[PDB]
């Protein structure tokens, strides 16, 4: 792996961690969900379904 | 699969060689430049014998148990009386590899870089025969008629007991896989011959002396194990004729071997462990894994143990266990056969099925057309494919292919039941589990006792000594009992009203089940059943005796090994130590015990699962003399007596 | 017609429909009821049982059969008994000992199966609770207050502060999750009125989410005025260290150096969140209110969502119950 | 490997069957017989009834080689020795 291969680690999330090149607010990211547990779907729940997920985990 | 170090040693050198007496009083190893003579009781080494110059690179011993020959790097051969004198030197080529006496003739080889020297017993000459190549390793064909040569260059040929070579097979790639043992399968008629001796005596010598100096094949029925370095493993006729594929492996492989039974194959080498296999060349398990590369692994004769000798001198003793796989229901015992197949026994028709697996067979349940079956990475669900009570044709209804952790496995209507060692799952056919239960103690015992398709009863003893009734359709475990100590085996009677408890301290206690209340106890048990239609009347195995007890009267006592797994009719289903007996009931005696006590209306329920006209007209005078006229009337019914029906 | 050994056959042969018929025939009292009703429990049918021992006039062990198969749903809807609230008090201590065993999950679910909904509620609302305050995934504490919620609900059901306010915790974790969505799909002014709708749910969500969400959001808007409104609520914060504080300064004084503290895009919700005028609804399917004077609200939480917007969901997007 | 015994019930005209391993000797005295066999020394006198259900297998260390039956006792003899069991049925 190259410099740039890794430097992806980084690359998309800073766009949510800094503004306009000027700002960095990582302190306050540390509260964020991550996007794909925060994600949610057109999906229906059903109370025995729902209490046997919620206990599954 | 279970093995266990029955002793150990460790010689001064590595060990390159292992020869068994027939009889399997003393084992003999190759040790560096001596030979070592042991006990295979406790590993005793009674003597170094001490003729060769340097290293004793193998050694054989001869069918009658007279002579054994041993070949070293100093280019000698030596054949030693079973007196451990060394009657006849010889002086080979060069040095010795491995040597092989004939099953039949005891005619010997002594095979080494170029040449293999074959002589029958006291002659005056050798056939010192020429070879292509370094000659490895070298096994006589099961009649006595061909020396099979495997070769460094990666070939095998079959040369006649005269020394002609007939047939060839070369690996593909040639000296890239030596061939480092090879083994014809003893599993033929000529495995009893010298079977029977009883001579009391040996042959004697003032001092050691020296030696001097075919068609339709493919109707041999032979079959040689090739072990070479390209690590794989395969199976070959006498006809050049490849079985089936090569197994794989993963190491060098060294001196694949057999037990007498020919069934079973041992496989030591770079793995630095004695695996064992099928005859299919299957995987079945793991004899002990050792510090160093392994040599040698020699199946003891007539028997189940084994001996390893490994690169640092470490000589290893092994039991092989071979534990007992099997389920009942109630008529119908399957269990394990080979390690690989189940057998379905009928219990009421006698009939049999073979259902083959491929790989081991670990657990099996059954219950009214459903046989659950578990292999290393998959669990198979059978069915029977008729509602007729004496249906045999399983087929696969569904195979689940994923791998599990257990203690004991059964099987309900629609569902497999898992206990994992404090955990109860229940899981769909198809592998979807459903519901699940935590006990308050690691699960010592369970039985299916019967239900509604899918809602059906399970019972279940724990170490604890609590006993409860799971129902597969529930949430909720529901304590039936608790004990001082824990439940070893568990088990209901025909009504569901009483139980019958194992209490892990070889006795048997029984219980009113409605009433949460102790009934009798028995003080040497170790397997207990209910009669699966004559409530009131249970059978146990302990202690050497099988023991039929009747309705807290005395218990009818007689000899027998093995164990009751079941009690229908006036039959016990009573397991040896390998197959089903089916022992019967004196009906007589209990009858005689209701008699006894004046209960006429009990005495029949014994009398009518099969007694003698003597023992039916008994009956019915007791009966009548009783004023038990509906007793009476039905015990002469049966002997068809008019006179008294009249009266 | 010898009903009383066809019984003893039905039940060795194993047709429970066999014997179920033949129980079905008999006349009420009749001398083979109980018997028939006891091989119905040896096997484990309740329904079967229940029906043999109401045949039989003998309505103590239907009862006492219920709660030995755990139907407690059935052993409490006897309601011709005084017993029905006496086993009330052993499904208490039942639901006692099963917290001494800690399976408060299996408590909750006897008391759903007591028709208890208000204990069950108040259980799943610990959860709930104990699940925000462990700082959990947030979707699955909105997965636990509608748990709840649905338990209040139906409490609510059975009737024809806890008690009457079913959905807070439900809204406050998923208008959380929506401005975080709302933040990750670059709409930060959609974000930005969702964390400000938060402000409401101090008692839920603890004040540090909130703010630095908002703080975030309102910083990304360039509402940075907002946003010195979340620093200053950060600051006042008395669980904080010094170094906390500190560091909140910090960055708040980073933005207010480098831009402002003040907003250079303003937002206009606090024209609600100030209260005297009262509030309209804030939308579930977008976190902002709904200027709409009459539209869509979900039969199950009834909360409104935007005539147009509910078109884009099949479930309601807050309880997901199927959209009516 | 057993001998197939066969007790036919010539009253009733039917077969019991019962495969015995190792059957030295039949003998009979009222409506009891003794199969003498060899234990699998040892050698077990299986005392049975008239439709061939075992009722008291008694083992003895004395080849059965001579075996007289009587309404109360079993006799059995090696060349060199004699065992007498008095024997019931309760």
């Known amino acids: 792996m190259t410099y740039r291969d890794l430097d992806n680690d980084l690359m998309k999330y800073s766009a949510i961690q800094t503004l306009d090149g000027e700002i960095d607010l990582k302190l306050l990211t540390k509260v964020l969900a991550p996007e794909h547990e925060v994600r949610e779907d057109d999906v229906g729940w059903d109370w025995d379904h729902l209490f046997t997920e919620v206990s599954s985990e | 699969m279970r093995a266990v170090l029955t002793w150990r040693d460790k010689a001064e050198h590595c060990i390159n060689d292992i020869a068994f007496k027939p009889d399997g009083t003393q084992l003999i190893l190759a040790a560096g430049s001596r030979l070592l003579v042991y006990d295979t009781s406790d590993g005793t080494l009674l003597q170094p014998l001490k003729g060769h110059k340097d290293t004793v690179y193998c050694v054989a011993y001869a069918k009658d148990g007279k002579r054994f020959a041993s070949g070293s790097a100093d280019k000698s051969v030596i054949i030693w009386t079973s007196k451990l004198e060394g009657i006849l030197k010889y002086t080979h080529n060069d040095a010795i590899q491995c040597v092989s006496y004939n099953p039949i003739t005891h005619q010997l080889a002594s095979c080494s870089s170029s040449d293999f020297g074959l002589w029958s017993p006291e002659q005056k000459s050798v056939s010192k025969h020429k070879s292509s190549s370094k000659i490895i390793c070298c096994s006589w064909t099961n009649d006595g008629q061909y020396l099979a040569l495997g070769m460094f260059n990666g070939i095998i040929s079959i040369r006649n007991k005269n020394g002609e070579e007939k047939v060839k097979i070369e690996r593909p790639g040639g000296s890239l896989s030596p061939i480092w043992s090879i083994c014809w399968n003893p599993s033929s008629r000529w495995e009893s011959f010298w079977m029977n001796r009883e001579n009391e005596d040996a042959e004697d010598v003032i001092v050691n002396r020296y030696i001097q100096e075919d068609d339709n094949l493919e109707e041999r029925n032979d079959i040689l194990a090739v072990a070479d370095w390209g690590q794989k493993v395969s199976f070959y006729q006498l006809s050049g004729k490849q079985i089936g594929k090569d197994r794989a492996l993963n190491f060098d492989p060294c001196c694949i071997s057999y037990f007498t039974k020919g069934e079973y194959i041992l496989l030591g080498g770079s793995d630095k462990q004695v695996s064992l296999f099928t005859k299919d060349g299957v995987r079945l398990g793991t004899v002990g894994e050792q510090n160093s590369w392994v040599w040698t692994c020699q199946a003891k004769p007539d028997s189940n143990y084994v001996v390893v000798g490994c690169q640092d001198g470490t000589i290893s003793f092994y039991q092989l266990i071979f534990s007992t796989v099997h389920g009942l229901y109630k008529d119908r015992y399957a269990y394990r056969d080979s390690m690989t197949d189940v057998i379905v026994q009928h219990l009421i028709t006698e009939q049999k099925v073979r259902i083959k697996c491929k790989e081991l067979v670990k657990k099996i349940a059954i219950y009214r057309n459903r046989l659950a079956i578990q292999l290393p990475e998959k669990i198979l669900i059978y069915e029977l494919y008729s509602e007729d009570l004496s249906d045999m044709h399983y087929r696969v209804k569904e195979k689940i292919i994923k791998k599990f952790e257990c203690n004991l496995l059964v099987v309900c209507a629609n569902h497999i039941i898992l206990c994992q060692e404090k955990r109860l799952q229940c899981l769909s056919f198809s592998g979807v589990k459903e519901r699940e239960w935590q006990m308050e103690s690691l699960i010592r015992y369970i039985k299916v006792i019967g239900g509604p398709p899918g809602r059906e009863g399970l019972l279940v003893g724990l170490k604890n000594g609590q006993i409860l009734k799971i129902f597969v359709d529930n949430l909720f475990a529901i304590v039936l009992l608790k004990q001082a100590t824990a439940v070893r085996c568990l088990d209901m009677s025909a009504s569901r009203k009483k139980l019958a408890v194992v209490d892990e301290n070889d006795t048997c206690l029984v219980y009113d089940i409605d009433t949460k209340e102790l009934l009798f106890q028995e003080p040497n048990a170790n397997s207990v059943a209910w009669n699966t239609q004559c409530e009131d009347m249970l059978c146990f195995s302990g202690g050497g005796y099988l023991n039929i007890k009747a309705s807290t009267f005395p218990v009818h006592r007689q000899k027998l090994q093995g164990f009751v797994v079941g009690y229908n009719g006036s039959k016990i289903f009573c397991l040896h130590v390998f197959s089903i007996s089916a022992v019967e009931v004196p009906q007589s005696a209990p009858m005689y015990q209701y008699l006894d006590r004046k209960l006429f209306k009990e005495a029949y329920q014994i009398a009518c699962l099969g007694v003698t006209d003597t023992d039916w007209r008994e009956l019915a005078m007791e009966a009548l003399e009783g004023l038990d006229f509906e007793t009476a009337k039905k015990a002469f019914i049966r002997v068809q007596d008019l006179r008294y029906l009249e009266l | ?324 | 490997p057993e001998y197939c015994v066969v007790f036919w019930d010539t009253k009733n005209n039917e077969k019991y069957v019962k495969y015995v391993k190792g059957l030295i000797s039949i003998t009979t005295c009222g409506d009891f017989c003794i199969l003498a066999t060899k234990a699998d020394a040892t050698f077990v006198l299986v005392l049975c009834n008239s439709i061939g259900t075992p009722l008291d297998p008694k083992y003895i260390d004395i080849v059965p080689l001579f075996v007289a039956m009587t309404k109360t006792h079993v006799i059995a003899a090696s060349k060199e020795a004699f065992y007498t069991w008095q024997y019931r049925v309760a």
């Open chain 3, 1 to 324: 017609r010898n009903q009383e050994r066809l019984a003893e056959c039905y039940y060795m042969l194993e047709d429970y429909e066999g014997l179920e018929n033949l129980a079905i025939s008999l006349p009420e009292n009749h001398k083979l009821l109980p018997e028939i009703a006891q091989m119905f429990v040896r096997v484990g049918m309740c329904e079967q049982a229940v029906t043999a021992f109401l045949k039989c006039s003998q309505p103590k062990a239907a009862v006492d059969t219920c709660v030995h198969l755990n139907q407690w749903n059935k052993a409490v809807e006897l309601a011709k008994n005084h017993s029905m609230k006496e086993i009330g008090s052993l499904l208490a201590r039942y639901a006692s000992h099963l917290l001494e065993k800690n399976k408060t999950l299996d408590a909750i679910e006897l008391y759903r199966k007591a028709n208890y909904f208000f204990d069950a509620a108040k259980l799943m609302f610990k959860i709930a609770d104990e699940e925000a305050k462990k700082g959990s995934k947030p979707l699955r504490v909105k997965k636990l207050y509608v748990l709840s919620a649905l338990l209040i609900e139906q409490y609510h059901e059975q009737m024809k502060r806890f008690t009457d306010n079913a959905w807070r915790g439900a809204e406050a974790y998923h208008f959380f999750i929506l401005a975080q969505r709302q933040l990750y799909e670059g709409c930060v002014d959609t974000a930005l009125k969702t964390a400000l709708h938060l402000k409401d749910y101090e008692d839920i969500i603890p004040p540090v989410e909130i703010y630095s969400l908002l703080a975030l959001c309102a910083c990304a808007s360039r509402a940075f005025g907002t946003c010195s409104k979340a620093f200053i609520k950060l600051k006042s914060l008395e669980t904080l260290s010094s170094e906390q504080k500190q560091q909140y300064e910090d960055l708040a004084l980073e933005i207010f150096t480098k831009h402002t503290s003040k907003d250079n895009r303003k937002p206009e919700l606090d024209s609600l969140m100030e209260g005297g005028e009262g509030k309209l609804p804030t939308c579930v399917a977008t976190g902002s209110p709904i200027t709409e004077y009459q539209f869509w609200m979900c039969s199950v939480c009834k909360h409104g969502v935007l005539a147009q917007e509910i078109s884009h969901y099949s479930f309601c997007p807050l309880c997901h119950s199927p959209v009516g």
